[model samples]
Target: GSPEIKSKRRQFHQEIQSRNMRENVKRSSVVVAAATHIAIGILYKRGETPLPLVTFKYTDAQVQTVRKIAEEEGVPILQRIPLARALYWDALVDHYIPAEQIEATAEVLRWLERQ
Candidate 1:
């Protein structure tokens, strides 16, 4: 194949892969959102916080171990993972809890730090 033709082929392949990744991310987001909704509903019914924050202080080696496990499970990077913002907004609109109560509880929970 001509050098130019090979370069173009490589570019097209990369573009297709990128598009597939994006679609996967979108589908994953929907799945995550559904799970989150179910979790939050159960927690809310049990008189618990919908959102739980935790701080994990893992050593570098431990972190790497977890990362390897995550890779094996095909988990995306944390930043690329999407939350159900629209779902949350709808919950708020439905008066799942008063906005002030939600904010206050979340603020207090933010202070909970553990190893």
Candidate 2:
């Protein structure tokens, strides 16, 4: 009985992992797109004026890394927008971009507000 139950539990977890991966793939796409938009806006700012467009480009490998980080942090992919924002902010802060960090904070705050 114990062995049979353990096997079923293992199978159930495998199914969840498979499903989570599929869902994460889709969620990561949106995260990548949003990050691109914020990056472009930051990069193309004209002096004091921010750029009119939001666009950031990322590779599949980068998306996978983000997803992996989120997974390791125990953040569900469906709740990944904040995690994505945090990762972006971490990079900006590491680079000593205080202004950009502030902007990213506001951006993520707005994102949370919408949710």
Candidate 3:
């Protein structure tokens, strides 16, 4: 069965969030949200189901009896250059700067956004 609407989604979101804070390798918000995007795509990942991700859509937008919630949630994307994974891990990962990452991220966003 599906999760309790938002419970598991919150859990999954928290799981991703925890990875960001607990791990030595700090992931950017782009990477974090991207994981959520992929989870939503597969309906689940790592025993967590974030399908629909309405919990993320919770913008605290309720001002009246209105209930048309906005669905603009963030997603993931990334890049490379063989830089500094070694400092944290066994070897370096890449040398790509912010601009390079953004370029690659846009490509992924295009792919993900397409039907």
Q: Note the clash tally of each candidate.
A: 0, 5, 10
C-alpha lDDT values of all predictions: 0.30, 0.36, 0.25
* Candidate 3 whole-model C-alpha lDDT, 0 to 1: 0.25
Highest TM-score among the candidates is held by which one? Answer: 2
- Extract clashing residue pairs from model 3: 34-75, 34-76, 81-95, 82-94, 82-95, 83-94, 83-95, 85-93, 86-91, 86-92
Q: Which runs of model 2 end up more than 4 angstroms from their true locations?
A: 1-59, 75-93, 96-101, 110-115
> Which digits, one per residue and each the tens of the lDDT, describe model 2 over residues 1-115?
4657745644553344432333443332123223322211122223633431222323345555555654565433233344435444433211222344456545543554455
Relative to the true structure, candidate 2 reaches a TM of: 0.26
lDDT of 3 by residue, 38-106 (tens): 111111122352221111111122211011111223333232112111111211122122333344434
lDDT of 3 at 30: 28
Indicate the residue-level lDDT of 114 in model 3. 67
lDDT of 2 at 80: 36
In candidate 3, stretches whose alpha carbon ends up further than 4 angstroms from where it belongs are: 1-97
By lDDT, who's the top model here? 2
Error of 2 at 115 (Å): 7.1
| Candidate that beats the other on TM-score, 2 or 3, i.e. the better one | 2
Candidates' TM-scores? 0.23, 0.26, 0.21
